[PDB]
């Protein structure tokens, strides 16, 4: 269970392994994949990444039919494991993670990359609980040479996906990632996801559009972050709040401490 000068010690999730260098004791994460055109694209995207709130790419090695993608280790594990079911987490902790998630998303959008699967399992934490956006297997280019390209592929994870993905032939990338961030903020503040999917047949989604916020999970959330969620989880992507306006929101700028 080794690759060149690295040993593969334990499974970090699915695969991704903890790679410990036998000589230096440096520890990184390595993604192992057994597709050739998909991995070439993913590597080009990974090589662009340079920000404190995004997992850094160290390089790749090919052994026969096996590809090894080496990346920055996030020793604090996932944000998912910090969310208490039915409770969430303390609001100051949720706001700090949300600021870091916005910093990472602004960075990605600034280089014309959309993640397309933002959710707590893909948001990792370093040793000082700094958030890192991970897994670029679904990531794509939405802006190149300053020209935006609409997306059409369905992907992501249904409870986090924006309604336009299900209803429109083509859609803008940025508002879809903004929406998934709103669902992550809901999960952090309530420890519960609001709907299986934001579709016409989902009653919990209809309830939200009718502003039935006396229901769960909304009733667990303070009015200030709920006011931000009312601006993010807006059905029409053209009326939905953009990141520059999230940065002007009252709760986003509210001082909080445990
Ligand atoms: C302690 N610890 C370190 C890590 N770690 N460090 C870096 C790193 C990079 C990636 Cl891509 C991954 C992935 C992230 C997507 N998940 C999927 C399963 O649900 C979603 C599998 C693992 C894990 C990584 C995780 N826990």
Q: Is the CB of 77 under 6 A from ligand 1?
A: yes
Q: What's the number of domains the chain is made of? A: 2
* Dihedral, 38, 41, 46, 51 alpha carbons, nearest 10: -120
CA–CA dist 191, 15 (Å, integer) = 27
In the residue annotation, 222 being an active-site residue is answered as no
* Dihedral, 61, 66, 67, 69 alpha carbons, nearest 10: -90
- Experimental technique, in short, is X-ray
CA–CA dist 101, 124 (Å, integer) = 10
For the chain, the helix, strand and coil percentages under 3-state DSSP, each to the nearest 5: 35, 20, 45
Pair 214, 92 in one domain: yes
CA–CA dist 194, 187 (Å, integer) = 8
The answer to whether the CB of 88 falls within 8 A of the CB of 190 is yes
Q: Is the CB of 71 under 6 A from ligand 1?
A: yes
Q: Which of the listed residues 71, 105, 123 is the one where a domain comes to its end?
A: 71
Pair 228, 103 in one domain: yes
Residue 254 included in any domain: no
Query: Which of 4, 9, 5, 11 shows the shortest CA–CA distance to 19?
Result: 9
Please, which residues bridge with residue 143 across strands? 148
Report how far Cα 173 is from the mean position of its chain's Cα atoms.
13
DSSP designation for 105: H
Q: Which atom of ligand 1 has the smallest separation from the CA of 74? A: 6
Q: Is 13 annotated as a binding residue?
A: yes
Residue that the structure tokens 């009312």 belong to: 230
* Nominal resolution (angstroms): 1.3
Domain extent, residue 183, equals 78-246
The phi and psi torsions of 54 (rounded to 5 degrees) equal -135, 140
The phi and psi torsions of 106 (rounded to 5 degrees) equal -60, -40
The answer to whether the CB of 189 falls within 8 A of the CB of 243 is no
Instruction: Report helix angle 91-110 to 173-190, nearest 10.
Output: 170
Query: Which of 163, 88, 72, 153 shows the shortest CA–CA distance to 120?
Result: 88
Q: Is 31 annotated as a binding residue?
A: yes
Pair 42, 133 in one domain: no
First and final C-alpha spacing in the chain? 44
Pair 56, 83 in one domain: no
């Amino acid at each position: 269970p080794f690759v060149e000068d690295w040993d593969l010690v334990q499974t970090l999730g699915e695969e991704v392994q903890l790679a410990v260098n036998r000589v230096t004791e440096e520890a990184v994460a390595v993604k192992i994949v057994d597709c050739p055109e998909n991995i070439k694209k993913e590597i080009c995207i990974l090589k662009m990444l340079n920000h404190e709130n995004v997992i850094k790419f160290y390089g790749h090695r090919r052994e026969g039919n096996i590809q090894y993608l080496f990346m920055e280790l996030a020793s604090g594990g996932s944000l998912f494991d910090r969310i208490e079911p039915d409770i969430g987490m303390p609001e100051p902790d949720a706001q700090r993670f949300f600021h870091q998630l916005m910093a990472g998303v602004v960075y990605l959008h600034g280089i014309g990359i959309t993640h397309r699967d933002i959710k707590p399992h893909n948001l990792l934490l370093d040793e000082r609980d700094n958030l890192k956006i991970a897994d670029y297997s679904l990531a794509t280019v939405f802006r190149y040479n300053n020209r935006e390209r609409l997306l059409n592929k369905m992907c992501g994870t249904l409870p986090y996906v924006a309604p336009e993905l299900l209803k429109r032939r083509e859609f803008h990338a940025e508002p879809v990632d903004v929406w998934s961030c709103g669902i992550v903020l809901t999960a952090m503040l309530a420890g519960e996801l609001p709907w299986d999917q934001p579709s016409d047949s989902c009653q919990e989604y209809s309830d939200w559009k009718e502003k039935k916020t006396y229901l769960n999970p909304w009733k667990k959330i303070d009015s200030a972050p709920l006011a931000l969620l009312h601006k993010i989880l807006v059905e029409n992507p053209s009326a939905r709040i953009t990141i520059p306006d999230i940065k002007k929101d009252r709760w986003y700028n509210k001082p909080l401490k445990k």
